[PDB]
Amino acid sequence: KRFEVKKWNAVALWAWDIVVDNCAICRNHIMDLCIECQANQASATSEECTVAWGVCNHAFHFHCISRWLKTRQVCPLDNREWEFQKYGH
Amino acid sequence: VYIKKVEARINEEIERVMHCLDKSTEEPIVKVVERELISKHMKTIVEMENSGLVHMLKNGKTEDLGCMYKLFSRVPNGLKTMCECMSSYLREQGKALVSEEGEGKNPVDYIQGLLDLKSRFDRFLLESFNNDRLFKQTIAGDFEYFLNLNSRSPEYLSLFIDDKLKKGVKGLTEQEVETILDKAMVLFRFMQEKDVFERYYKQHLARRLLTNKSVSDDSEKNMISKLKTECGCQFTSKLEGMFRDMSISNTTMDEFRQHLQATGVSLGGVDLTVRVLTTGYWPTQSATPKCNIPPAPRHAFEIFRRFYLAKHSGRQLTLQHHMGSADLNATTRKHILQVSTFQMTILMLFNNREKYTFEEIQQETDIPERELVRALQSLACGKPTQRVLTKEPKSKEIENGHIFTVNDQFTSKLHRVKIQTVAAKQGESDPERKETRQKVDDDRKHEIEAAIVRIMKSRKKMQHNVLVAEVTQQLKARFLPSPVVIKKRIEGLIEREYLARTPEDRKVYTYVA
Ligand SMILES: [Zn+2]
Ligand SMILES: [Zn+2]
Ligand SMILES: [Zn+2]
């Protein structure tokens, strides 16, 4: 051949049990509102209800995890105390 | 000459009242001597022209500044009359410098000029005013006055620190590097809107760590130590996470090299360098591009995904193209090219069959839009006499039916020639600026709504505007208070279970935890 690849350096991202189809706290979907909301409108304004991303790389609706934090504060899908980094999908 | 002659007059009056008269009578007169005499014309003097304060500031005769400082120290309100004029001059120079008119202010040069004028002002202050408190607070307020404008300044300073950290070519030794870094963080000290600063600093970290390594390998510790004294430890969760992700990436790289030396039956697993990090830390570039990949990178990505889904039970993988690089071994000698995960698919399609066009690479590739355009242009457009992908229809704009060819270009005096069309002159186009502004706006929104739920659970309640003062004081060193935004967002806690904060019954608030 005329051009042959010798070296490659991809960077491979990884996702834990974020479940990009079912929030693990309320069980609705990674997006599509939460249980305390449901209605896409209803005094929401640009639906103030987005996805929250932990350091443990799990994902839930901000509302669900922030309401769950009131009581239990250690991420239900492992044991890690749970921190924050990215908001939204 | 007026200051010198009035000083001579003061001295001769002092010696006269010390001999011919009695020193006791000097005080009332020296009052008028600084009042009905100095104060009188001091006005005309603390302004006007004829080699005046505003002219000696731009000329730089420090002896005159020191002389007038030691002279006007006796007359009351004289320090104020000179502070107001020097502040007017500094505000003029500032609005002449922050001039946004004529978009094109060179980033590393605008902030350099800002440092140049604040340093000369501070040195004139320390040599003449002897570190006076009044002049210091006046220049502080002056700096706070014009720094509310020019919102690209944190981005300009972040681009400056990236240019200084990528390679220490200028100032090979460590002493001047240390001094320039201290001056940089001092300049950053008198800067607001730290959120965009941290965002762009993290973006520059991602740009400098996901590229060719061995930039400094030691200055990162100095940077993180300086940031612990500057930004604090609230942004080191994602900072140390970037470092830990780089560490895990190289560890998994050597581990996958070992596991490939064991298996690696396919030729796809040759010289492989696969890094591993998590979404939270490094933001998603786009919608995980899924364009056709060359058979070798396909096999490499398949092996990496199988490993990440097997050993890491629960974790998986997400293929993408908007990151990384490669070394394309071309072949009179064998010169190895370089492709940054963008030209691999097009060059592989050319290897499979040459004489393609835009339709061929847009039909049988599943190629995206903006980034495809970018790569194609970088490869056949705006190229110096090192063209690796030529075409017959020579033109600036991109057509559809244009055949692509290849040229030798023996000007490469080595075997490792790279095409670094990416990371060009800092343009900062409107779409990327708007999207990062929206991102930092959503970040600010989440930040204020995360600080309020952390604080007001252990504090008292507000009636109308009591706790907003506290939530703005806690964020004074972060960014602007944005009263309208926070007022519109706090009324969104009614839908939240924690502290509905009843608007009509604002007499008593809840504390459900
Ligand atoms: Zn949920
Ligand atoms: Zn919700
Ligand atoms: Zn977790």
mmCIF file of C-alpha atoms in Angstrom, chain A residues 1-20 34 36-37 42-50 53-58 62-72 83-89, chain B residues 210 237-238 270-284 296-298 300-301 304 313-318 320 323-331 337 341 344 350-351 354 406 446 453 489 495-498 512-513:
data_model
loop_
_atom_site.group_PDB
_atom_site.id
_atom_site.type_symbol
_atom_site.label_atom_id
_atom_site.label_comp_id
_atom_site.label_asym_id
_atom_site.label_seq_id
_atom_site.Cartn_x
_atom_site.Cartn_y
_atom_site.Cartn_z
ATOM 1 C CA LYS A 1 0.000 0.000 0.000
ATOM 2 C CA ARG A 2 0.935 3.682 -0.234
ATOM 3 C CA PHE A 3 -0.041 4.812 3.291
ATOM 4 C CA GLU A 4 0.154 2.494 6.308
ATOM 5 C CA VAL A 5 -0.740 3.436 9.881
ATOM 6 C CA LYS A 6 1.990 2.591 12.423
ATOM 7 C CA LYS A 7 1.048 4.491 15.629
ATOM 8 C CA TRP A 8 -2.394 5.440 17.003
ATOM 9 C CA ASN A 9 -3.325 7.346 20.131
ATOM 10 C CA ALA A 10 -7.028 7.271 20.658
ATOM 11 C CA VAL A 11 -8.403 8.326 23.939
ATOM 12 C CA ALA A 12 -11.170 6.151 25.170
ATOM 13 C CA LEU A 13 -13.814 7.661 27.420
ATOM 14 C CA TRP A 14 -15.830 5.436 29.760
ATOM 15 C CA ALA A 15 -19.248 5.529 31.426
ATOM 16 C CA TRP A 16 -20.211 3.583 34.634
ATOM 17 C CA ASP A 17 -23.841 2.618 35.389
ATOM 18 C CA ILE A 18 -24.990 6.112 34.284
ATOM 19 C CA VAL A 19 -27.755 4.049 32.511
ATOM 20 C CA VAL A 20 -28.297 6.438 29.509
ATOM 21 C CA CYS A 34 -38.111 13.302 36.758
ATOM 22 C CA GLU A 36 -41.178 15.346 41.053
ATOM 23 C CA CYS A 37 -41.688 17.089 37.653
ATOM 24 C CA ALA A 42 -45.796 23.704 34.313
ATOM 25 C CA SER A 43 -44.034 26.708 35.823
ATOM 26 C CA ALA A 44 -40.734 25.181 34.737
ATOM 27 C CA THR A 45 -39.257 27.819 32.423
ATOM 28 C CA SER A 46 -36.819 26.108 30.059
ATOM 29 C CA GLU A 47 -37.502 23.068 32.279
ATOM 30 C CA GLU A 48 -35.216 23.846 35.224
ATOM 31 C CA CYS A 49 -34.462 20.152 35.591
ATOM 32 C CA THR A 50 -31.198 18.793 34.091
ATOM 33 C CA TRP A 53 -22.761 14.054 36.649
ATOM 34 C CA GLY A 54 -20.718 12.628 39.531
ATOM 35 C CA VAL A 55 -16.971 12.001 39.768
ATOM 36 C CA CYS A 56 -17.859 8.315 40.042
ATOM 37 C CA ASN A 57 -19.214 9.022 36.525
ATOM 38 C CA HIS A 58 -22.771 7.925 37.326
ATOM 39 C CA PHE A 62 -30.071 16.896 39.295
ATOM 40 C CA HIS A 63 -33.417 17.092 41.201
ATOM 41 C CA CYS A 64 -33.425 13.363 42.164
ATOM 42 C CA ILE A 65 -29.845 13.193 43.479
ATOM 43 C CA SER A 66 -30.059 16.651 45.138
ATOM 44 C CA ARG A 67 -33.325 15.584 46.892
ATOM 45 C CA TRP A 68 -31.707 12.196 47.721
ATOM 46 C CA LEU A 69 -28.669 14.073 49.194
ATOM 47 C CA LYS A 70 -31.007 15.568 51.882
ATOM 48 C CA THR A 71 -30.882 12.152 53.647
ATOM 49 C CA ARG A 72 -28.370 9.592 52.235
ATOM 50 C CA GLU A 83 -18.687 14.806 44.086
ATOM 51 C CA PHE A 84 -19.641 17.056 41.110
ATOM 52 C CA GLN A 85 -17.998 18.071 37.781
ATOM 53 C CA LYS A 86 -20.381 18.218 34.760
ATOM 54 C CA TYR A 87 -24.047 19.413 34.652
ATOM 55 C CA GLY A 88 -26.431 18.632 31.789
ATOM 56 C CA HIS A 89 -25.908 15.732 29.368
ATOM 57 C CA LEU B 210 -4.153 15.374 25.130
ATOM 58 C CA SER B 237 -11.350 18.561 42.504
ATOM 59 C CA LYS B 238 -11.454 18.713 38.689
ATOM 60 C CA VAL B 270 0.322 -2.566 16.444
ATOM 61 C CA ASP B 271 1.932 0.529 18.071
ATOM 62 C CA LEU B 272 -1.081 1.482 20.211
ATOM 63 C CA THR B 273 -1.457 4.366 22.659
ATOM 64 C CA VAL B 274 -5.003 4.361 24.107
ATOM 65 C CA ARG B 275 -5.628 6.800 27.010
ATOM 66 C CA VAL B 276 -8.588 6.303 29.452
ATOM 67 C CA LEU B 277 -10.424 9.136 31.325
ATOM 68 C CA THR B 278 -14.016 9.807 32.555
ATOM 69 C CA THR B 279 -16.770 12.115 31.117
ATOM 70 C CA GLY B 280 -17.287 14.332 34.211
ATOM 71 C CA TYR B 281 -13.674 15.638 34.090
ATOM 72 C CA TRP B 282 -13.051 16.007 30.306
ATOM 73 C CA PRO B 283 -16.177 17.556 28.626
ATOM 74 C CA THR B 284 -17.748 15.913 25.520
ATOM 75 C CA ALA B 296 -6.616 -0.773 11.918
ATOM 76 C CA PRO B 297 -8.055 2.024 14.233
ATOM 77 C CA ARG B 298 -11.348 0.110 14.052
ATOM 78 C CA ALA B 300 -7.811 -0.948 18.055
ATOM 79 C CA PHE B 301 -11.015 0.739 19.243
ATOM 80 C CA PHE B 304 -10.094 -1.159 23.792
ATOM 81 C CA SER B 313 -17.642 -4.653 34.755
ATOM 82 C CA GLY B 314 -20.313 -1.903 34.605
ATOM 83 C CA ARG B 315 -18.054 0.552 32.719
ATOM 84 C CA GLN B 316 -18.162 0.664 28.870
ATOM 85 C CA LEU B 317 -16.743 2.793 25.984
ATOM 86 C CA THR B 318 -17.842 5.570 23.544
ATOM 87 C CA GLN B 320 -15.164 9.333 18.959
ATOM 88 C CA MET B 323 -9.335 13.836 19.903
ATOM 89 C CA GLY B 324 -5.875 12.289 19.584
ATOM 90 C CA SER B 325 -3.321 11.884 16.821
ATOM 91 C CA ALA B 326 -1.520 9.257 14.752
ATOM 92 C CA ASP B 327 1.658 8.644 12.743
ATOM 93 C CA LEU B 328 0.984 7.752 9.099
ATOM 94 C CA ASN B 329 3.970 5.871 7.651
ATOM 95 C CA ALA B 330 4.131 7.019 4.036
ATOM 96 C CA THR B 331 6.517 5.999 1.259
ATOM 97 C CA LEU B 337 3.216 11.733 8.334
ATOM 98 C CA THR B 341 -7.726 11.574 14.129
ATOM 99 C CA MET B 344 -7.335 9.038 8.937
ATOM 100 C CA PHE B 350 -7.885 7.097 -0.656
ATOM 101 C CA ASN B 351 -5.733 4.034 0.053
ATOM 102 C CA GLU B 354 -7.876 7.024 -5.157
ATOM 103 C CA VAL B 406 -1.003 13.503 -3.613
ATOM 104 C CA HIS B 446 -25.882 25.662 39.066
ATOM 105 C CA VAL B 453 -28.825 24.820 49.366
ATOM 106 C CA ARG B 489 -33.733 31.592 40.038
ATOM 107 C CA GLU B 495 -40.868 23.416 42.738
ATOM 108 C CA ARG B 496 -37.906 21.908 44.687
ATOM 109 C CA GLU B 497 -38.748 19.778 47.781
ATOM 110 C CA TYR B 498 -35.903 21.301 49.872
ATOM 111 C CA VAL B 512 -36.740 20.112 55.502
ATOM 112 C CA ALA B 513 -33.433 18.155 55.331
#
